[PDB]
Write a sequence for this structure.
């Protein structure tokens, strides 16, 4: 049984650093800007 | 007498008759056919170059150019020796052969046939 | 832009019911196709050929259907009338293989005809089940002892009846009859559709003859008639194939 | 002029002038640059020539 | 102990590390303000071939 | 007229999941690199899409990369990685091992990994070689230049052994996992590994 | 005599060449396939032809029906090739030809549903080079010669960029200059 | 006794390759005895070696009467009362050693009807970020 579904929003950031401390702020902004856009669908 | 010559001449006339039948309809009258199941022009395989050999690289004359030259070519070795395949024979058969230069000619024809690549 | 998509045209049933193409599946320059002629890289030029705007105008859009030590070949005939038009064809079957069920072949074969009536599938599969189960231990034989029977053979394809005669040894297994029919159609210059149709008309005769070696066990290996050149020295062949239009 | 020029990657002064006129016009919109050159050049070549 | 497959390792890995160190020489100040990256460097091929991609993504 | 009713969902080619599943199944090495990078990204960002419970014909597709890494670990006591063809296989093996490490924090992608009687042989093999490092035995002395190849090799195995140990809950007497880890604990200086 | 026979062979070989008007798209993972030789992926997905189990399944008949399916697809790329259209022309049992058709459709060598108007273009390999495919002499167009390794370029073709290689434009835009 | 006249009157002259110098028009020997041994090791009542002699002589002389056309399998099957499964063996045997289809008009050989050959066609790849050409 197939279901053609839209996939999840994967955070592929433009510049890709390697240390974690240069990432966490952008990933927090992504989690907020994804869960707020997704909360209204419910 | 007059039996075996008559039978063999009838065989040769039947052979040439089948050739003159098969050459007019396919190639001469309308140059191909048409399959009804798929819109594909059927053609005899003898005019089609069954395999494909290796590729060739080069460079253009003027440097700092962006043009692509895709093309084709034909190739053969000597185009006169036929392809009576002796390579589809194991190498244990023809070792009780009468001569040695006969063995040399068989190995020469087989090494010619294994040069299908360039 | 300006590129044709790679799929989504399946104009096959209209050529099945074209009444000009000699397809025996249904009843109810000067070239025709540009497979040797360039068009100077405009696709619009292919719309000058009369069988090709037929497949753009009368086409439709299809969705793609998605999916042992010795083979035993059994020929299967198929003759079903259904709403005026009929279905008459033939195909082999591998009895030792079971990778595809006759229900699945019925669902595939009904999809190209564009019927999908959900009851043709059951009828086709029941006919295939019947003709398979009727012939389970008659094609699994191990024939020895040099039968060497004569074979007359006929083939029906749209008032273009094929007929020939030859001596056959059904004891050695070197010559595939599909290779035999290939050697015939290479020589007589026929279309490729005679490649299955002769061999599918031969295996049946092989299991017609095999039948009499097993069921009644009538040997009757007595003088296969020849012309005193080969096997039986009469004085020291039979016929030749042909294609007659009736 | 209005005629079709020679084989590409020549870039006559007319085409250079019209390219720079387009860049002063639109500041973006390389379709609207490439037609103002004359429409016989692609976007992917006008950007490769302005760089 | 075995000198063959460590000298081949040296000749491979020294070459690879030289290429890695010489992976960054065309991103200077006055090597990019000039024109000897874009024009005539089809020998390089690395950039000015992304322009068919980067315009199609809207970045410019 | 027939070119107007195209289904919008399939007019981009194949979908990306079948693209990733076919790319590994072929033999083209750069497309294998692409497929493993995308499997790693989907395993980090949304693991339920690659849950082994949902896609059953996916775990042998990673076993066929992880199981030839044992020969590399056997040969890693000398400078074995000479050309640029064995190293690519090494990096593909380590990346697939990371993918199976990342899928093993799910509790439904885990029982399939436990019931396989061959991933545990690989875990036991890597732990035995790390015990040979941690004790100092003269058999299989570690070559130092391969050490960064081995070090992150042994952080991705313990995190499997940290996850599947709950399903090895009957502990026997002469066990090799318990003996090996109690040998390892005396040696290391990592807070995370302790 | 040799120059005239070479020109004669070049003429009657360009007479039978099946010139291309449609581009053919395969998926990128199925670039392992070549028309000439049988790859090892085909030998482990369809083992019934190579085990020498039965007599009716040789590698020669496999290669013949495989080239039949792919050549009758690529001459009409826009049209979805079906099983019943193939079964009436090739003489094999039905299960094996369905296996081969489903195999070739699995890898996207035939029946690859794509609309190339909604995807960009790239330049992957190098720009220039005289890429010349080397075919064989079609035995049947060989000279009679009642009693010579001459190679002949049939079709020269130039392309300015990959964007016109992908859409089969051979600088005929000097005709249609827009 | 019967084929002397037939070789004398209306046969075009003999052309034979160098690796067929071991051939004997009079009798048979070990190469033909070990290649297809079914005519010798009592396969049937039919497959006695004298019929093999007669058929190989008939085939090679039928090619002698027309050296510039391909001798097909059907055209010899018209007047050879033998198994077709052995006519194919002897015909492929004599063609295989380059005797009776060696030097012919190459547009006489029967080829199976089929579609065109698509090997020189241009293929483009469906890369997941574009449509790069397929140039090895």
């Amino acid at each position: 049984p197939l279901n053609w579904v839209q996939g999840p929003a994967i955070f592929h950031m433009l510049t890709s650093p390697y240390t974690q401390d240069e990432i966490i702020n952008h990933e927090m902004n992504f989690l907020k800007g994804r869960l707020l856009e997704l909360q209204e669908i419910t | 007498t007059n039996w075996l010559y008559q039978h063999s001449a009838a065989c040769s006339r039947f052979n040439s008759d089948l050739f003159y039948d098969r050459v007019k309809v396919l190639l001469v009258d309308q140059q191909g056919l048409r399959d009804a199941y798929t819109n594909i022009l059927h053609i005899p395989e003898s005019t089609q170059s069954t395999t494909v050999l290796g590729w060739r690289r080069s460079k253009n004359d003027s440097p700092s150019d962006t043009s692509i030259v895709y093309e084709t070519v034909i190739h053969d070795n000597d185009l006169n020796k036929p392809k009576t395949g002796l390579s589809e024979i194991p190498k244990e058969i023809y070792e009780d052969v009468v001569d040695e230069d006969v063995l040399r000619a068989i190995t020469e024809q087989q090494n010619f046939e294994k040069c299908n690549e360039y | 832009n300006q590129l044709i998509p790679q799929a989504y045209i399946s104009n096959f049933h209209n050529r099945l019911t074209n009444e000009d193409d000699g397809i025996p599946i249904f009843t109810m320059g000067n070239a025709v196709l540009p497979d040797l002629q360039d068009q100077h890289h405009n696709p619009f030029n292919i719309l000058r050929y009369p069988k090709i705007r037929d497949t753009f105008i009368n086409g439709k859009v299809v969705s793609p259907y998605r999916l042992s030590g010795e083979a035993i070949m059994i020929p299967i005939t198929l003759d079903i009338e259904h709403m005026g038009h009929t279905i008459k064809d033939q195909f082999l079957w591998n009895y030792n293989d079971d990778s595809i069920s006759p229900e699945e072949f019925a669902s595939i074969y009904c999809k190209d005809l564009d019927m999908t009536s959900a009851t043709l599938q059951t009828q086709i599969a029941n006919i295939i089940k019947e003709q398979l189960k009727d012939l389970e231990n008659i094609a699994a034989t191990e024939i020895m002892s040099d039968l060497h029977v004569i074979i007359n053979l006929t083939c029906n394809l749209q008032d273009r009846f094929f007929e020939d005669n030859f001596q056959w040894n059904l004891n050695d297994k070197s010559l595939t009859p599909e290779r035999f029919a290939t050697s015939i159609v290479q020589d007589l210059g026929l279309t490729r559709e005679f490649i299955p149709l002769i061999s599918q008309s031969l295996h049946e005769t092989i299991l017609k003859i095999k039948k009499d070696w097993v069921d009644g066990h009538l040997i009757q290996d007595h003088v296969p008639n020849d012309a005193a050149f080969g096997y039986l020295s009469g004085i020291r062949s039979n016929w030749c194939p042909r294609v007659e239009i009736l | 002029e209005n005629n079709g020029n020679s084989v590409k990657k020549n870039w006559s002064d007319q085409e250079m002038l019209l390219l720079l006129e387009g860049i002063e016009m639109y500041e973006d919109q390389w379709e609207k640059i490439a037609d103002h050159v004359g429409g016989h050049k692609r976007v992917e070549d006008c950007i490769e020539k302005f760089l | 102990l075995h000198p063959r497959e460590t000298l081949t390792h040296y000749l491979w890995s020294s070459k690879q590390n030289e290429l890695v160190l010489q992976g960054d020489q065309y991103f200077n100040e006055d090597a990019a303000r000039t024109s000897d990256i874009y024009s005539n460097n089809n020998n390089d091929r690395s950039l000015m071939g992304n322009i068919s991609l980067l315009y199609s993504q809207g970045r410019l | 007229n027939v070119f107007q009713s195209l289904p919008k969902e399939t007019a981009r080619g194949v979908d990306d999941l079948t693209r990733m599943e076919m790319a590994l199944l072929s033999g083209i090495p750069e497309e294998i690199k692409w497929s493993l990078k995308k499997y790693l990204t989907y395993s980090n960002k949304a693991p339920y899409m690659i849950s082994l419970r949902t896609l059953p014909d996916l775990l042998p597709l990673f076993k066929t990369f992880i199981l030839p890494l044992e020969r590399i670990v056997e040969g890693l006591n000398k400078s074995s990685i000479c050309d640029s063809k064995a190293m690519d296989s090494l990096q593909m093996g380590l990346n697939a091992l990371l993918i199976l490490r990342n899928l093993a924090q799910d509790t439904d992608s885990v029982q399939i990994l436990v019931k396989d009687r061959e991933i545990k042989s690989f875990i036991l093999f890597i732990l035995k070689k790390f015990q040979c490092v941690a004790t100092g035995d003269n058999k299989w002395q570690l070559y130092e230049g391969n050490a960064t190849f081995f070090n992150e090799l042994t952080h991705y195995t313990l995190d499997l052994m940290e996850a599947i140990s709950s399903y090895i809950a009957p502990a026997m007497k002469d066990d090799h996992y318990f003996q090996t880890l109690v040998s390892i604990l005396n040696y290391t200086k990592d807070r995370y590994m302790v | 005599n040799y120059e005239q026979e070479a020109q004669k062979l070049e003429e009657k070989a360009l007479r039978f060449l099946a010139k291309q008007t449609h581009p053919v798209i395969i998926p990128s993972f199925a670039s392992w396939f070549d028309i000439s030789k049988i790859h090892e992926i085909e030998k482990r997905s369809n083992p019934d032809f190579f085990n020498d189990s039965s007599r009716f399944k040789t590698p020669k008949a496999y290669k013949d029906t495989r080239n039949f399916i792919i050549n009758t697809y690529r001459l009409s790329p826009y049209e979805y090739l079906t099983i019943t259209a193939v079964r009436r022309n090739v003489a094999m049992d039905v299960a094996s030809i369905v296996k081969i058709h489903a195999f070739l459709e699995k890898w996207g060598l035939i029946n690859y549903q794509i609309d190339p108007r909604t995807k960009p273009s790239l330049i992957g390999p190098s720009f220039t080079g005289h890429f010349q495919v080397v075919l064989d002499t079609p035995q049947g167009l060989k000279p009679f010669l009642p009693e010579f390794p001459v190679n002949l370029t049939i079709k020269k073709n130039v392309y300015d960029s990959a964007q016109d290689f992908n859409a089969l434009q051979d600088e005929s835009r000097n005709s249609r200059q827009i």
